[PDB]
Design a protein around this nucleic acid. Structure first.
Lengths: 63, 386, 17, 136
RNA sequence: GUGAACAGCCUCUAGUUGAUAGAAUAAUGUAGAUAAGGGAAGUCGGCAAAAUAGAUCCGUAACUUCGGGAUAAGGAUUGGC
RNA sequence: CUCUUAAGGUAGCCAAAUGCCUCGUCAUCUAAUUAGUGACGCGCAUGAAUGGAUUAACGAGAUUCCCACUGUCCCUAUCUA
RNA sequence: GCAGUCAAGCGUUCAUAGCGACAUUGCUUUUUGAUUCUUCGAUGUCGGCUCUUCCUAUCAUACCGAAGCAGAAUUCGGUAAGCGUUGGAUUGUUCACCCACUAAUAGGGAACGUGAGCUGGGUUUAGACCGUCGUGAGACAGGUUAGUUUUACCCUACUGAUGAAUGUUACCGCAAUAGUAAUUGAACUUAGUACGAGAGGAACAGUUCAUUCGGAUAAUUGGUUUUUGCGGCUGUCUGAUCAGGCAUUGCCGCGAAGCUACCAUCCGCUGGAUUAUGGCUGAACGCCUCUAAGUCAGAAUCCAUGCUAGAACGCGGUGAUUUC
């Protein structure tokens, strides 16, 4: 198998889980569940959603 | 006159009547035909349906597009603790059918078996099989005279087994008694095999093995009274229909002046006895071995139970059988796994299935982690633990 | 009498021709 | 499919019944295709014939050059908005429904394909994969 | 009080708490709803339902009894501090 | 030319709510239309205050098409009282 | 409407490969008439929708027999109702005509199946208009538009569900009988091979999928939200913060569990006996002949294997059977 990463949140995507979205030009997105896909569809920015991995990197969380 | 156009029949007429089953344990109507050359072995087994998970494996099917490629398949997990032989039964051949002749029980019976024979066990004196135990107090001639009658007559021999309910997370506390036919040769050896196995336990790997096509016999999940729209799948009436639209418009013609048995009518849905066949075994697990969920390609130390345990069932701590596909009946239901009645060589069988990964994420939601150590590594540290 | 028990006038019901 | 298909197709979830309007993915001059029939479809009462990715359909042109209109011509669906499950296990779906104009044999009317092309459609029609730049 | 408003909604004064109840949540109903992909292929018939909706700014055709058509059609903006 | 007769359908209009034949013929609209619209007129049986023709605006009137919208439908599912 | 008999002739020659005149014998009650037997102190009427079953005069699928059948394609005939026979534009339509898919888009019956099942578009009350006819009131199997579709709680039938009595009670079984189910196509290979001058061009076995149908299932995907679970927003109210009430579930976003979807996944058995027919041996009829005696192979056929129910008046095995 191969473990993919979520485009919106950043969590691990095991085989069978989640969905896959292809934008019109050439881009392929991967989502772990319907929560990440619905937030992406609403044009929400992942750097403003507090539980995403991209949020923690910018706001110096974790470390 | 003709209908207006020809349409297929709604439902199957062979599954009638669709009534509630007479018992929660489905009967085994047929057994594999005996072969005298084969050794004495069981034909079926009893287990409890835990739940379902996901497996990733390589597909070995020449002429197909996914050949040497990975696929995901849904599998069922059935908890199968070892059963205990408590007696044997012989059946003689009669022109009216098969007739039971002599039933010989074991000397000592556990309280799980005695729980079956009582409806008010907390109020009873537990006197079951007390005077029968006096037959073993003598030299043994009382049991041997009843056992030698099964060697001469009773061309069909069946064994009595019961499940160990106390080894499962269920709070039902009562064993399930059933008859399993012995398939071997030399009818005298069948009762010698059963005599030695009194108060003894047989495991699940002695009956089934890897890549074996078996049949599942269980009771369908019940749904109570159901309308004709979901019980038979008939077409819904238009929105303009007065007096309801989830019905059947024409239930019959003028002549004959009776409602036929072949029309769709509302009634009980579910809780029927079903027999699904051609199910391949993917794993024969052990209850005394750790890392049941581990694979030679995954190597991570984890057992088959999901995060937080199986939903509405608990955790697997005994031997289990992993079956590809779906199994009739819901969780916590007694099921009867039976070997195939014919040799299948359609190349869907005869293939050796080697897994690559077993899904063990939580089935209580959209799980993101397989092991508890994986959750701590991804999330780092929290306020509660540190 | 009332709005029910309709038998007489009709668009396509009984008492036609 | 029918004639000209190089192999079989695994079942893809149907998303385009009769009457659906999908975009035109090639440079034949048509703007959209109006699906009127599906080749190789079944026969059930009241059930509409539906199309999927890689299926060959008969479609008309509603918007485009006047010489491509008012006539029925074969078409091949290359994109699907309805999510379908691959045997690998991923649930994928495109942003819109697109098709290309082809002859009964399988050769395309145009020469280039805009946007991505599904992997199942490229394997079934060799000439579609030759004119497709990016696949999934 | 909100708002253009005697609209809808909430509250004060004042007045009621009166319509046989209890226990469960099958089918079929009545009333209210939501649905992936397609978008009238349903049907005698877009029946029913959905969509549109206030204000401000921009823009507005054929035709005409020159008064209209016109809120034509079609777009943008709207909080808090 | 001429029969009969008080005089023989003028201006307009039409398979129109008026055309039996008829699903009239041609064009247009659709992948496909006994529908719709525009034309053709020896019109069974159109026609001038029995008012003819044309008309902006208006209509809980009768129809066709298009855009948008939608469980009408493909194909049903679930929830509340 | 359908099927025979005869065979003048057509078919390049050749009546019956296939058609077949002039005649003549029947069948059918899915057409329309004829009749007026039942019903006018009422049997609710056309079409469509919906649903079941039956008929064969067989459209497709199965197996065969013939051709003026090389292959391919097709036509005709036999056994056969097991299993299928569609999506749309127009019309109230039945009927019909086109578009398209498909292995195929066969014909019919069940009070011209089916209104206390639906719909009310047609016809067939009362309103109103037009044309023709009539002095007029009015007429028209002419056109046009609008017009209340009532009741089951009874009996039976059907779908499910209890249940007295067989000493009591409990467990494990047997199977009399009834029902039964799967279906069709494509691709690869066979093979550009057999066949054919060429052009063209198969089939058996094997493999992979798909069409329609059925039985289950919820790991995943999608749907559903009164978990009123969490968060957000508007108006108003509790002095404010906090925390909440109300707006007939206030609205919005996410949302487990449960339910559910060819909108998700899994699965759907193999033996015997036969029809048509092709044979073997072999008479009648010294010869000849699949038939007369006997016997072999043989269809989506039938019966079993398997699957569902378990006679509540069918049965078996086994455990325990009370002292105030």
């Amino acid at each position: 198998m191969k473990v993919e990463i979520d485009s919106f949140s950043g969590a691990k995507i095991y085989p069978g889980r989640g969905t896959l979205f292809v934008r019109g030009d050439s881009k392929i997105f991967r989502f772990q569940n319907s929560k990440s896909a619905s937030l992406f569809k609403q044009r929400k920015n992942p750097r403003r959603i507090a539980w995403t991995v991209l949020f923690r990197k910018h706001h110096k969380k974790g470390i | 006159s003709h209908r207006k156009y020809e349409a297929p029949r709604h439902g199957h007429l062979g599954f009638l009547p669709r009534k509630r089953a007479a018992s929660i344990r489905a009967r085994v109507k047929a057994f594999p035909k005996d072969d005298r050359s084969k050794p004495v072995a069981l034909t079926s087994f009893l287990g409890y349906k835990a739940g379902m998970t996901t497996i990733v494996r390589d597909l070995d099917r020449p002429g197909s597009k996914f050949h040497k490629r990975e696929v995901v398949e849904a599998v069922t997990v059935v908890d199968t603790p070892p059963v205990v032989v408590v007696g044997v039964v012989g059946y003689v051949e009669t022109p009216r059918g098969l007739r039971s002749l002599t039933t010989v029980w074991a000397e000592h019976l556990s309280d799980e078996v005695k729980r079956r024979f009582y409806k008010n066990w907390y109020k009873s004196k537990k006197k079951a099989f007390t005077k029968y135990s006096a037959k073993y107090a003598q030299d043994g001639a009382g049991i041997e005279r009843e056992l030698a009658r099964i060697k001469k007559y009773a061309s069909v021999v069946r064994v009595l087994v019961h499940t160990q309910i106390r080894k499962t997370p269920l709070a039902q506390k009562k064993a399930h008694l059933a008859e399993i036919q012995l398939n071997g040769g030399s009818i005298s050896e069948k009762v010698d095999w059963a005599r030695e196995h009194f108060e003894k336990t047989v495991a699940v790997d002695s009956v089934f093995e890897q890549n074996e096509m078996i049949d599942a016999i269980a009771v369908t999940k019940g749904h109570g009274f159901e309308g004709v729209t979901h019980r038979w799948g008939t077409k819904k009436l238009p929105r303009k229909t007065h007096r309801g639209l989830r019905k059947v418009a024409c239930i019959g013609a003028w002549h004959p002046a009776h409602v036929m048995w072949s029309v769709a009518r509302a009634g009980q849905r579910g809780y029927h006895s079903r027999t699904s066949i051609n199910h391949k075994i993917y794993r024969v697990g052990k209850g005394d071995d750790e890392a049941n969920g581990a694979t030679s390609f995954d190597r991570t130390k984890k057992t088959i139970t999901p995060m937080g345990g199986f939903v509405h069932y608990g955790e697997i701590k005994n031997d289990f059988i992993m079956v590809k596909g779906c199994i009739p009946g819901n969780r916590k239901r007694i099921v009867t796994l039976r070997k195939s009645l014919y040799t299948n060589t359609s190349r869907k069988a005869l293939e050796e299935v080697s897994l690559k990964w077993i899904d063990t994420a939580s089935k209580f939601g959209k799980g993101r982690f397989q092991t508890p150590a994986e959750k701590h590594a991804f999330m780092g540290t929290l306020k509660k633990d540190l | 009498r009332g709005r029910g028990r309709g038998r007489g006038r009709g668009r396509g019901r009984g008492r036609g021709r | 499919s029918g004639n000209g298909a190089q192999g079989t197709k695994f079942r893809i979830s149907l998303g385009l019944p009769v009457g659906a309007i999908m975009n035109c993915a090639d440079n034949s001059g048509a703007r959209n295709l109006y699906i009127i029939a599906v080749k190789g479809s079944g026969s059930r009462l009241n059930r509409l014939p539906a199309a999927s990715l890689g299926d060959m359909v008969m479609a008309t042109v509603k918007k485009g050059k006047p010489e491509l209109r008012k006539k029925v011509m074969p078409a091949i669906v290359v994109r699907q908005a309805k999510s379908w499950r691959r045997r690998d296990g991923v649930f994928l779906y495109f942003e819109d429904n697109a098709g290309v104009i082809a002859n009964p044999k399988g050769e395309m009317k145009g020469s280039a394909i805009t946007g991505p092309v599904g992997k199942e459609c490229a394997d079934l029609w060799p000439r579609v994969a030759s004119n497709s730049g990016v696949v999934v």
